Amino acid sequence: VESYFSDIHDFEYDKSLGSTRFFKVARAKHREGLVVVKVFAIQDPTLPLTSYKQELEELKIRLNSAQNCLPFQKASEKASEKAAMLFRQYVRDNLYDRISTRPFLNNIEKRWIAFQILTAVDQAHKSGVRHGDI
Amino acid sequence: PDKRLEAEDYLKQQRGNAFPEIFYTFLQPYMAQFAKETFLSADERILVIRKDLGNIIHNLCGHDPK
Amino acid sequence: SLFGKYGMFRQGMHDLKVWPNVEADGSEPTKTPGRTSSTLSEDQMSRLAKLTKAHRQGHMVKVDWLDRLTFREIEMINESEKRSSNFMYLMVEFRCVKCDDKEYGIVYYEKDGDLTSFELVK
Ligand SMILES: Nc1nc2c(ncn2[C@@H]2O[C@H](COP(=O)(O)OP(=O)(O)OP(=O)(O)O)[C@@H](O)[C@H]2O)c(=O)[nH]1
């Protein structure tokens, strides 16, 4: 995954966050801070990636005003002749790690985390965005 | 799917039960200032919290589960 | 106050008004202030005392004929005030710093004294 960052001068590869057949996720440093980059390797160039890029740009415009919603801020169709890349802000912790990282979330923190999840869904629905992978 | 409510309905149904009222009235509105696009440096955040300290204690503790 | 209105440490001789029968108070603002700022009632003695000192240091224009009369007037004011205001004045002098014969002033400064919109960082 790090090899794909060699072509993006504004992003400096930092660490690999995961590899799957669908998306390879890695963390990179950018002038704005840390960013998570999911790289989709284009195996068949005949895939209508432009249609998906337009859908992602629509998602960015629809979710730009949501405070608890983080859409993909950048979608690059031909970032490299080999792969299309999606860029978004890096957050310190994912919920999967946060549960096991101290301080352990208290009952009041657990209620607060649940409350914010619901608020994120409410805001996304009113903003016209559905997650599909919650 | 017909049994799933809308996101706003769950927040209303659990308002005061699973989520204490303090989350909606102050925690969500106050905290939203820190997640805004306008970056508050760590120094600025401390000063903002210091300035509001009296209001935060009044809003969280009341005059007095607080 | 150790730092002046402009953050400069006090220098030279300073006459501080002593409040009778009370311990020196350290709260901010002090209840027993030694240097009555210009915001309060301008004590003609305090204003004239500052002027006499400003004259001594050579910060006021010397007019020989005026001085003999003016200073004689100040002497009368100070004599009259000493009779009615029985307040004591304690003199304190702060040290001065010199290097290569030049005087240096200590100004309050913090050791660490020397992007609002992000495109990607929300
Ligand atoms: N601490 C931390 N973990 C992250 C960050 N970004 C992603 N991760 C985690 O690293 C892994 C990346 O895989 P994902 O593709 O996001 O997994 P997923 O959320 O189940 O799949 P999607 O629904 O497509 O997002 C997951 O465990 C994420 O929680 C981050 O910025 N900080």
Contact A56, A86 (CB under 8 A): yes
Give C4's contacts (C-beta < 8 A, 6+ positions apart): C10
- Chain C CB within 8 Å of residue B17 CB: no
The DSSP code sequence of A38-58 is EEEE-S-TTS-HHHHHHHHHH
Give A5's contacts (C-beta < 8 A, 6+ positions apart): A11, A12, A13, A26, A28, A37
Contact C32, C25 (CB under 8 A): yes
Write out residues 11-70 of A within 8 Å (CB-CB) of C: 30, 32-33, 35, 70
- Chain B CB within 8 Å of residue A67 CB: yes
Experimental method: cryo-EM
Q: Which long-range contacts (CB under 8 A, 24 or more apart) does C48-57 make?
A: C48/C74, C48/C77, C48/C78, C49/C15, C49/C78, C53/C13, C57/C12
Contact A87, A28 (CB under 8 A): no
Contact A65, A58 (CB under 8 A): no
Ligand 1: lining residues by beta carbon, under 6 Å: A 17-18, 23, 25, 36, 90-91, 93-94, 96-97, 133
Q: Measured between CB atoms, which of B8, B19, B36 is closest to A115?
A: B19
Q: How far is CA C24 from the centre of its chain?
A: 17
- Chain B CB within 8 Å of residue A113 CB: no
C22: nearest Cα among C30, C10, C11, C14:
C30
Angle between helices C64-84 and C44-56 (to 10 degrees): 140
* Resolution of the structure in the document, Å: 4.5
Q: Which atom of ligand 1 is nearest to the CA of A23?
A: 15
Residue bearing the CA closest to ligand 1, atom 16:
A25
Dmax (CA) of chain A: 51
Which tokens hold the place of B40?
């508050």
CA B14/CA A115 separation, integer angstroms:
9
The DSSP code sequence of A62-106 is HHTT-TT----SEEEEEEETTEEEEEEE--S--HHHHTTSSSPPP
CA A25/CA A12 separation, integer angstroms:
14
Answer positive or negative: Cα dihedral of C116, C117, C118, C122.
positive
CB contact under 8 A, C119 and A73: yes
Q: Which long-range contacts (CB under 8 A, 24 or more apart) does C51-57 make?
A: C53/C13, C57/C12
C10: nearest Cα among C98, C92, C100, C109:
C92
CA A79/CA A25 separation, integer angstroms:
15
DSSP character for B19?
B
Which tokens hold the place of A12?
């400096």
Helix boundaries (H) for B1-66: 7-13, 21-22, 28-31, 42-61
